[PDB]
Amino acid sequence: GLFDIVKKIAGHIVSSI
Amino acid sequence: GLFDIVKKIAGHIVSSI
Amino acid sequence: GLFDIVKKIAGHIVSSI
Amino acid sequence: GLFDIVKKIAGHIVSSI
Amino acid sequence: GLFDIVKKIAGHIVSSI
Amino acid sequence: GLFDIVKKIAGHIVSSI
Amino acid sequence: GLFDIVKKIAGHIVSSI
Amino acid sequence: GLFDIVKKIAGHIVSSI
Amino acid sequence: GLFDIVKKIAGHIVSSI
Amino acid sequence: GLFDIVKKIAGHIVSSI
Amino acid sequence: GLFDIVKKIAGHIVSSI
Amino acid sequence: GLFDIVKKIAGHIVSSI
Amino acid sequence: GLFDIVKKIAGHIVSSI
Amino acid sequence: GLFDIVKKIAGHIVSSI
Amino acid sequence: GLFDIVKKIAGHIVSSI
Amino acid sequence: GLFDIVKKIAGHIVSSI
Amino acid sequence: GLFDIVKKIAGHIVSSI
Amino acid sequence: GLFDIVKKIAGHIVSSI
């Protein structure tokens, strides 16, 4: 079992829940 | 089992739930 | 079992819950 | 549910942008 | 639920941006 | 639930930005 | 509406025996 | 609304026996 | 609303026996 | 305008929401 | 305007919300 | 405007919220 | 009774009972 | 009774009972 | 009774009962 | 890597969720 | 790596959540 | 690495959450 997760973001306004 | 997930985003406004 | 998680962000305003 | 990625949502949502 | 990534949400949400 | 990453949310949320 | 009866439910609801 | 009855529920609700 | 009855619940609620 | 509302429940075991 | 509201519940075991 | 509200519950065991 | 009412609403998203 | 009422509302998101 | 009322509201997000 | 899981339920009325 | 898990429930009325 | 877990419940009315 192995997970390799990459999440890259960029922006003037960044929102998330 | 192996996961290789890449998520790249860019924008003036970025929203997500 | 192994997890390799990388989360990189950049922005003028960054919000999260 | 083994070795699995799960994302769920349930309700009343409202998004403006 | 073994070796698993879980994200859940349940309710009344409101997002402005 | 073993070897697992869990994130949960439940309620009334309001986000302005 | 002036004279009203309002009743709302929103989310993950369970009723078990 | 002027004369009202309001009743709201929002979230993860459980009723078990 | 002027004459009102308001009743709200929001969160993780449990009722068990 | 009258509102005549009646709810009745009976049983050895009851779960209500 | 009258509101005549009645709720009745009876049982050996009860769970209510 | 009158509000005539009545709630009655009876049982060997009760859980209420 | 006598009811004289005026309502003006403006918005991207609107909900009215 | 006599009711004289005025309401003005403005916003990206609005909820009114 | 006699009711004379005025309401003015402005905002990105609004909730009114 | 070895795992042994046993889950066992017995009754007149049963609910698994 | 070795694991042993046992879960065992018995009754007239049962609820697992 | 070795683990032994035992969970055991018995009764007329049972709730596991």
Residue numbers in the entry:
A (entry chain G), B (entry chain A), C (entry chain M), D (entry chain E), E (entry chain K), F (entry chain Q), ...: 1 to 17
The authors write:
Supporting this hypothesis, we here determined the fibril structure of two AMPs from amphibians, uperin 3.5 and aurein 3.3, by cryogenic electron microscopy (cryo-EM), revealing amyloid cross-β fibrils of mated β-sheets at atomic resolution. For both of the studied ffAMPs, cryo-EM data unambiguously prove an amyloid cross-β structure comprised of β-sheets with tightly coupled dry interfaces and strands perpendicular to the fibril axis. Despite the dissimilarity in lateral fibril structure and the difference of extended versus kinked β-sheets, the 17-residue ffAMPs uperin 3.5 and aurein 3.3 are remarkably similar in their residue composition. Overall, compared to other amyloids, the sequence content of the two AMPs indicates a dominant apolar and positively charged nature, which fits the functional interactions with negatively charged bacterial membranes.
A recently developed computational screen aimed to identify fibril-forming AMPs (ffAMPs) additional to uperin 3.5 found fourteen new sequences, including aurein 3.3, another amphibian AMP secreted by Ranoidea raniformis (Southern bell frog). In contrast to the case of uperin 3.5, we did not observe any pronounced polymorphism of fibrils formed by the antimicrobial peptide aurein 3.3. Two of those (chains E, F) are arranged in a cross-like shape conforming to C21 screw-symmetry along the fibril axis and form kinked β-sheets in their inner section which closely meet at a roughly 90° bend near Gly11. Wrapped around this inner cross are four more strands of mutually similar conformation, each having a sharp in-plane kink near the outward-facing His12 residue, which is enabled by Gly11 leaving a void into which Val14 can fold. The outer chains, in particular C and D, cross the fibril normal at an unusually large angle and are strongly bent in the plane of their respective β-sheet, which, together with the screw symmetry of the inner cross, leads to a complex staggered structure of the fibril without well-defined rungs. The overall packing of the aurein 3.3 fibril is highly dense, with the SASA buried for a single layer (fibril cross-section of six lateral chains) covering 9802 Å2, which is 83% of the total area of this layer. In the outer chains C and D, the C-terminal part of the kinked β-sheet forms tightly mated β-sheet interactions with the C-terminal part of the inner chain F, overall showing a stable interface of three short β-sheets, resembling lateral association between β-sheets in the crystal structures of short amyloid segments. Overall, the lateral association of β-sheets in the aurein 3.3 fibril shows very few potential polar interactions and is mostly stabilized by van der Waals forces. Here we show the cryo-EM structure of aurein 3.3, revealing a cross-β fibril with kinked β-sheets. Such sharp kinks in the peptide backbone are the hallmark of Low-complexity Amyloid-like Reversible Kinked Segments (LARKS) within functional amyloids.
